[PDB]
Design a protein around this nucleic acid. Structure first.
Ligand SMILES: [Mg+2]
Ligand SMILES: [Mg+2]
Ligand SMILES: [Mg+2]
Ligand SMILES: [Mg+2]
Ligand SMILES: [Mg+2]
Ligand SMILES: [Mg+2]
Ligand SMILES: [Mg+2]
Ligand SMILES: [Mg+2]
Ligand SMILES: [Mg+2]
Ligand SMILES: [Mg+2]
Ligand SMILES: [Mg+2]
Ligand SMILES: [Mg+2]
Ligand SMILES: [Mg+2]
Ligand SMILES: [Mg+2]
Ligand SMILES: [Mg+2]
Lengths: 210, 203, 102, 38, 48, 80
RNA sequence: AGCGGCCCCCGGCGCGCCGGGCCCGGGUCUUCCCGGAGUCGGGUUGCUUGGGAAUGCAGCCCAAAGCGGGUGGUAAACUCC
RNA sequence: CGCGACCUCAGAUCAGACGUGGCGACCCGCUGAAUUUAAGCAUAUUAGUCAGCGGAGGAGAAGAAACUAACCAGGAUUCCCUCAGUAACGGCGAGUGAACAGGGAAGAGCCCAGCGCCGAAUCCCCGCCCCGCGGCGGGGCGCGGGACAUGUGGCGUACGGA
C-alpha cells in the first residue's frame, strides 16, 4: 500500500535468503594466514624474488582502456627467439612464457625484447657446484649482492610525452575539423550503395552502347 | 597403417557390407543375456583410442539397455497438483543411455573401475554398448607410472558422479557465450554465489 | 590537404606498422594429403555408395538439377553441404561417361 | 526427524574401537616397538 | 544374401599347393626364444 | 564511452607555469593541451575563455567549440 | 614472565660410501601429420534458461565433409574478413 | 582320430588379491512439490528449493580455449570488489535477472592413440643365492611356465610443428 510521492522499489527477498547468509567475521584471520604463508614461501625460495618471475608489457584492449598499459602473463615465443633464448630453460631463470599469444605489430615486440636484455644484465646466476663453467658469475658480486627484491620486478609505469610550444601556422588555422568528421561518417555509410548504383549505371551503359 | 583403413570403413554405416554385419550381430547379441563378458573387443581401434592397451588387467563388458523415454512413475496418472504438472508420457530423461549403461556395470563390478565406453549396435527396442574396465590392484598397473593415477581413492565410481566423457556432456561444461552457468564448476555453485548474500562487517 | 588520423570512417585507428611471419599452421588442419587420399578412394570402390546419393544420380542423368538439390537438403540438412555434394556426385558421373564411352 | 537420528548415532553408546583410534592418531599409528627398557 | 567382399574368403587353396607353400616357409622362421640368448652371448663375445 | 568537458574547465588540466609563461616572450608560444591524457575525449563549447592562442588535441569536437578557439586565435587538432 | 635450565622419542634440510641406471644437446636442406563418427549437424517434441524466428540438455527420424569444420546474441541467400 | 586353436562356453572349500556396511556439517550426479504472492485464479512466482535415491575426500568439482573481442587488442581454472538491481525475460502485470573489460589473492603445466623407425627391443608368476625387512623392495642365475603380432615398449602431439 503506497503513499504520497515516494519511489517504487523491487527488493529481491521473496526467496529463502536466510539459510544462506555469509559473515565476514573471519576477515582478519584470513589476512593473518596469508602473511605466514607469504613469508614462508619467500624463505623457501631464499634469494629468488618473492613476487615471482618476470612478466611482460601488454596493452589493454578496448576503446576505454585503449591507452593504458599493464602487466601480462608471458613472453611470446617470437620475441624470445629474437633474444636467442630457448623456451625450456627460461622457466628456470625466472621468465614467464605463454604460447597462446600473437604479434600484429613491431613496436610491441622491440620493447619487451629490450626489457629481457636489461634483465639478463641485472641477473645473477649461481653455479651448481663450486666449479664455474659457462654462465656462472664471479664470487665477488655473488657475495656482495645476493638478496631478494621487494615487490615486482622492473615495474610497469605509464610514461607520457611533452610536446613543446610551437607557433601556429596558417595550415592549421584553415582546418575545418567538425565538417571533416561529418563528411567522414557519410562516406563510410554510403561507400557500397554508391558503387552498386554506379555499377548498375555502367551495366546499362553497355545497353546504351549496344 | 591398417587402423586407418579400418577407421574410414566404420564411418560408412549404410553400405551393403556394414548393413550385413550389424544385422547379423544384433541377432546374435539379442539372443545372449543382458550383461555378459566379452573376451576381446569388437572395435579394437576405437578402444585403443580411448585408452585400451592390450595387457592383462584390462577388461571388456557388453551391455544392453532399452530404448524410449521415461514414464512418470505414479498411479493412474493423476498427479495431485497444478495443470502444468499433469505430464506423464512426453518426458525426456536428463541423461543419455550411454552413461546409464556404464552405471550398471560399475554397480555389478564394484572393485573394477570404469574408464570409458562406445557404441556397437542398434535395434527397435534395444541398444548395445561396450564398456572398458580395470582392476586396480594388479601389479602390472600398479608398477606402471602412467596409469596409476587411477589407483588413488578419489577416482572411485566416476560413473555415479559424472566424470567420464558421457557424463560430462549432460552437465554442460564449456567456456563461451553459450554456457554462463557452471562458471564455478557446476550449476549448484553458480546458483549459490548468485543467490547468496554477502554481509561485510562495516558496510 | 593536411589529413589527420581520424577516429572514424573508412580508415580509422591509431596507426602502426605490421609484422609478417609464418602463421600458426595449426590452422592447416583438415587438409588433403596424398596418402590419406589413397585411402578414401580405395574404400569407395570396395563399399560403394549410399541409397540417397544413389537415388540422386538418377535425377542427374535426366538433368532434373533443381529436384536433386532439394532432395539432398531434406535428407542431409544445410544448403551448403548439399551444394558441395551435388558437385562431387556429378564428377562421379563424369568419369563414368568418360570411362565407358570408348 | 532430527530427534530420531540423534538417539542412535556413532556417538551414543560405547565406541569401544574408535576410542582408541583417536588415541593412536595422536602419535602416528606406530606399532611394532616398545619404549626404552630399564 | 552374402555380398562378395566377404564371399571371397571362401575361394581358397587345395592340398597340393598349401603343402608346398608351408613346406617352403618352414625354412625362414623367426628367432626362437633362447635361440636369441645364444645369439647375443656369441655376439657381444666378439668384442675380444 | 565519451567523457565530456567544457572550455572553462580546460586551463585546469595544466599547471600555472604554463598559462603565465604564455602571453610572454612573444614568440607565438601557443601551448599544447591533450585531453586524452587527463581522461576526456570530446570538447564542448559551454563557456568562454581568456585571450591566448592555445592549441588543443582531442578525438572529437563540437561546432561552437571549434569556432570560439579560432575566434581567440588558436587551432584544433584531431587524433585517433 | 623469561631469545630460562635437565631428560626422552619422532622430524625433516644438507656432506660422506658402494649398487644400478643414462650416455642421453643446440644454428642452414628432403619427407610426415594435416590428426579422435551413429559424432558434428539438421528436423519435430518435452524440461530448463536473462537468452528473446528455439541458451542448454535428452529422446525418435535423417545423417556428413577434409584448403574442411565451429563461432562471430534477428530467420535466409551471395560474398570479403 | 588324437592333437592346435579360438566361435566360444561352464565348473571347483584350487593358489593369491579385492568390493559390500556406518557417519553424512562442506562436496558431485539424478529425481523433484504444495502451502504462499498475484488483494480472485489457470501461465508465471515460491523453486531446480524441503522431502526422496545414489557416491565420495580432507577438501571436492572445474581446468590448460572447437575463448573473449572488433581494440595501438588480450590469453588455463578458482575466490573477492565492480560492472548491476543493469542488458534482457515477463497475464510486458506481480515479479525475475546475468557476462565481458578493469583492479587484486594465487600462480605450474603436461601425457596418449593414429601416422612413422628400432632382430617385441616389453610385462607377470614360480625356483635358487645375497642385502633388507612392521607403507614386501633391490641385485644376480633357471633350453622354468605364461600374456603379447586381433600390436607390448623406447623417439614424438600440434606451444603449430615433428
Ligand atoms: Mg513518504
Ligand atoms: Mg543434436
Ligand atoms: Mg522457469
Ligand atoms: Mg558406501
Ligand atoms: Mg492469491
Ligand atoms: Mg488474500
Ligand atoms: Mg485461494
Ligand atoms: Mg501454474
Ligand atoms: Mg522456477
Ligand atoms: Mg534433501
Ligand atoms: Mg580433482
Ligand atoms: Mg549505478
Ligand atoms: Mg528464477
Ligand atoms: Mg575478468
Ligand atoms: Mg599478487
Amino acid at each position: 500500500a503506497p503513499s504520497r510521492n515516494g519511489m517504487i522499489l523491487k527488493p529481491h527477498f521473496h526467496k529463502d535468503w536466510q539459510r544462506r547468509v555469509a559473515t565476514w567475521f573471519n576477515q582478519p584471520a584470513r589476512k593473518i594466514r596469508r602473511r605466514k604463508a607469504r613469508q614462508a614461501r619467500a624463505r623457501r625460495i631464499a634469494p629468488r624474488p618473492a613476487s615471482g618471475p618476470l612478466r611482460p608489457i601488454v596493452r589493454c584492449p578496448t576503446v576505454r582502456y585503449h591507452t593504458k598499459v599493464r602487466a601480462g602473463r608471458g613472453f611470446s615465443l617470437e620475441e624470445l627467439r629474437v633474444a636467442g633464448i630457448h623456451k625450456k630453460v627460461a622457466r628456470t631463470i625466472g621468465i614467464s612464457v605463454d604460447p597462446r599469444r600473437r604479434n600484429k605489430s613491431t613496436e610491441s615486440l622491440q620493447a619487451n625484447v629490450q626489457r629481457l636484455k636489461e634483465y639478463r644484465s641485472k641477473l645473477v646466476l649461481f653455479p651448481r657446484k663450486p666449479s664455474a663453467p659457462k654462465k656462472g658469475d664471479s664470487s665477488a658480486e655473488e657475495l656482495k649482492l645476493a638478496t631478494q627484491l621487494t615487490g615486482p620486478v622492473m615495474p610497469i609505469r605509464n610514461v607520457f610525452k611533452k610536446e613543446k610550444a610551437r607557433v601556429i601556422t596558417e595550415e592549421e588555422k584553415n582546418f575545418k575539423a567538425f565538417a571533416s568528421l561529418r563528411m567522414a561518417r557519410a562516406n563510410a555509410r554510403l561507400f557500397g550503395i554508391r558503387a552498386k548504383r554506379a555499377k548498375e549505371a555502367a551495366e546499362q551503359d553497355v545497353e546504351k552502347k549496344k | 597403417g591398417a587402423y586407418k583403413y579400418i577407421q574410414e570403413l566404420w564411418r560408412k554405416k549404410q553400405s551393403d557390407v556394414m548393413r550385413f554385419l550389424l544385422r547379423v550381430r544384433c541377432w546374435q547379441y539379442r539372443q545372449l543375456s543382458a550383461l555378459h563378458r566379452a573376451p576381446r573387443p569388437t572395435r579394437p581401434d576405437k578402444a585403443r583410442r580411448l585408452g585400451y592397451k592390450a595387457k592383462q588387467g584390462y577388461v571388456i563388458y557388453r551391455i544392453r539397455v532399452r530404448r524410449g523415454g521415461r514414464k512418470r512413475p505414479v498411479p493412474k496418472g493423476a498427479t495431485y497438483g497444478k495443470p502444468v504438472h499433469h505430464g506423464v508420457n512426453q518426458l525426456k530423461f536428463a541423461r543419455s543411455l550411454q552413461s546409464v549403461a556404464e552405471e550398471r556395470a560399475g554397480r555389478h563390478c564394484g572393485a573394477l573401475r570404469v574408464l570409458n565406453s562406445y557404441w556397437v549396435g542398434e535395434d527397435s527396442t534395444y541398444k548395445f554398448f561396450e564398456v572398458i574396465l580395470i582392476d586396480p590392484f594388479h601389479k602390472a598397473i600398479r608398477r606402471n607410472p602412467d596409469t596409476q593415477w587411477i589407483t588413488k581413492p578419489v577416482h572411485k565410481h566416476r560413473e555415479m558422479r559424472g566424470l567420464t566423457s558421457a557424463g560430462r556432456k549432460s552437465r554442460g561444461l564449456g567456456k563461451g557465450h553459450k554456457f554462463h552457468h557452471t562458471i564455478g564448476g557446476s550449476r549448484r555453485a553458480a546458483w549459490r554465489r548468485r543467490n547468496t548474500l554477502q554481509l561485510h562487517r562495516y558496510r | 590537404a593536411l589529413r589527420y588520423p581520424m577516429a572514424v570512417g573508412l580508415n580509422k585507428g591509431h596507426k602502426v606498422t605490421k609484422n609478417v611471419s609464418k602463421p600458426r599452421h595449426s590452422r592447416r588442419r583438415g587438409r588433403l594429403t596424398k596418402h590419406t587420399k589413397f585411402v578414401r578412394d580405395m574404400i569407395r570402390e570396395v563399399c560403394g555408395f549410399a541409397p540417397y546419393e544413389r537415388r540422386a544420380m538418377e535425377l542427374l542423368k535426366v538433368s532434373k538439377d533443381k529436384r536433386a538439390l532439394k532432395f539432398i537438403k531434406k535428407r542431409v540438412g544445410t544448403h551448403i553441404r548439399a551444394k558441395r555434394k551435388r558437385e562431387e556426385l556429378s564428377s562421379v558421373l563424369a568419369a563414368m561417361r568418360k570411362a565407358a564411352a570408348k | 526427524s532430527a530427534k530420531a537420528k540423534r538417539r542412535n548415532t556413532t556417538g551414543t553408546g560405547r565406541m569401544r574401537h574408535l576410542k582408541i583410534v583417536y588415541r593412536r592418531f595422536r602419535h602416528g599409528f606406530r606399532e611394532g616397538t616398545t619404549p626404552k627398557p630399564k | 544374401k552374402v555380398p562378395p567382399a566377404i564371399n571371397q574368403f571362401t575361394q581358397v587353396l587345395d592340398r597340393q599347393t598349401a603343402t608346398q607353400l608351408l613346406k617352403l616357409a618352414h625354412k625362414y622362421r623367426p628367432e626362437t626364444k633362447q635361440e636369441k640368448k645364444q645369439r647375443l652371448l656369441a655376439r657381444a663375445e666378439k668384442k675380444a | 564511452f565519451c567523457p565530456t568537458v567544457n572550455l572553462d574547465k580546460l586551463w585546469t588540466l595544466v599547471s600555472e607555469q604554463t598559462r603565465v609563461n604564455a602571453a610572454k616572450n612573444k614568440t607565438g608560444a601557443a601551448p599544447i593541451i591533450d585531453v586524452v591524457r587527463s581522461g576526456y575525449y570530446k570538447v564542448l563549447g559551454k563557456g568562454k575563455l581568456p585571450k591566448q592562442p592555445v592549441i588543443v588535441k582531442a578525438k572529437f569536437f563540437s561546432r561552437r567549440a571549434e569556432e570560439k578557439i579560432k575566434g581567440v586565435g588558436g587551432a584544433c587538432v584531431l587524433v585517433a
